[PDB]
Structure formats: C-alpha cells, structure tokens
Specification:
The protein has 214 residues and is α+β, with helices and mostly antiparallel strands. Helix content is 13%, strand content 21%. The structure holds chloride ion (CL) (2 copies). Belongs to the cyclophilin-type PPIase family.
Length: 214
C-alpha cells in the first residue's frame, strides 16, 4: 500500500500550501483525493482570506497545536457550505472523511470538530507529539509502515475521530516552536501566534477529471 504522508514529495494528485505564521512558515501537502471535503473547505477558506489574522489559540507541547477559529477560543468557525448546501453541512459542519491511508502521525493536519458527527467547520490542528507509543498499536488495524511511522510520534487515539487531510513537509521546527510558546492556564499563547497569510503553491481544481499515472 502507498501511504502518501510518508513522502515529502508533492504527488501530481496532491495540493501544497504554506502557512505564513508570525513564528515562521509551515509547508503542508494536502490529500484532495482522500479527504475532498476537508481539502476544498480549507483551500477555499484560505483563498477567501478566512484564516488571515487567525491565531493558534491552543498549544500543548507533546500533543498538538490548534487554530482555524475566527473567535480565538475554540468555539467558532463554519464550513464553506454552512447555510448554502445541506447535502454537505446540515448546520454544525461537514462529515468526517476517515480513510485507512491517512493517520494522526506527527506532522498530520486534521480537522478538530466537537467529537460528534458532522461537526467539521474551519478549525484544524497539527499533530506535534514526538513520543514512540507504537508498541500499543493493534497490528490488525495499523499497517506495518504506519506503525513504523508512529515511532517518530503521533496521537493514534485521534484516528477515526479526526479526519486527516494534510501533512507538514517543511517547517515542523516552526510547529514545535509554536507548541512550546509561553501560554496561560487555558493553553493560549501569551503573545499571539498568527497566520498572516496562506500561500497556495499548488492548487487543486475539484472539477478536474484528469487521470494521473500512479
Ligand atoms: Cl513521516
Ligand atoms: Cl461525521
């Protein structure tokens, strides 16, 4: 099996963005063929300026950093289909796109949501854990190459609950710097860490029917 998170190369069927944050650049490749709703929602919000000035409002070293909330407290954000297309957003967000090809390994980009179905809106997080807990993973559920990948860290308890849609391929040192920022009792950084802009290096057209040789 091919696990697209295990290569830093951007495949022909992948997209690429750079989060230009006040702490540095995070280069991320996206998986529109595996998580089409999460990637379309993210790319459209990015190009529409929805994340310009948005903060990393909650950081936990050894766990993850989360962002994408216009309210800055983890209670806000909407999908691009909210009050536009009920076949995609019934009112609280879009559905989880879980696939056996994407996991919450270190560097994985996933949607936050409330833990209930159809609650993916605009909030997302980057897995930042760097501890090896791979010996506890059931070999009947985790492919051997993914168990190997988890040795570098990740949050496997998030698999199946949080849809993965991207992978950091550059600037993980910036993600670690953000995760260790000085913060208050609610884990909100003392000095705001902002997404100043998102550069779409390689976009993806959801109406494209091009076939790519694998
Ligand atoms: Cl990896
Ligand atoms: Cl769902």
């Amino acid at each position: 099996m091919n696990f697209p998170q295990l290569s830093k190369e951007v495949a022909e069927d992948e997209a690429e963005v750079i989060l230009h944050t006040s702490q540095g650049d995070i280069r991320i490749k996206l998986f529109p063929k595996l998580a089409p709703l999460a990637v379309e929602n993210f790319l459209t919000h990015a190009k529409e300026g929805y994340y310009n000035g948005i903060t990393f409002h909650r950081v936990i070293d050894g766990f993850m950093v989360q962002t994408g909330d216009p309210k800055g407290d983890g209670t806000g954000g909407q999908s691009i289909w909210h009050d536009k297309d009920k076949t995609k957003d019934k009112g609280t967000g879009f559905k989880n796109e879980i696939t056996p090809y994407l996991y919450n390994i270190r560097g994985a980009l996933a949607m936050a949501n409330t833990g209930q179905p159809n609650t993916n809106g605009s909030q997302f997080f980057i897995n930042q854990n760097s501890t090896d807990t791979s010996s506890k993973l059931p070999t009947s559920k985790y492919p051997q190459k993914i168990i190997e990948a988890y040795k570098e860290g990740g949050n496997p308890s998030l698999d199946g609950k949080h849809p993965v849609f991207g992978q950091v391929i550059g600037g993980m040192d910036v993600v670690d710097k953000i995760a260790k920022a000085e913060k208050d009792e609610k884990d909100k950084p003392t000095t705001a860490i902002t997404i100043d802009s998102i550069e779409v290096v390689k976009d993806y057209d959801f109406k494209s029917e091009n076939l790519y040789f694998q």
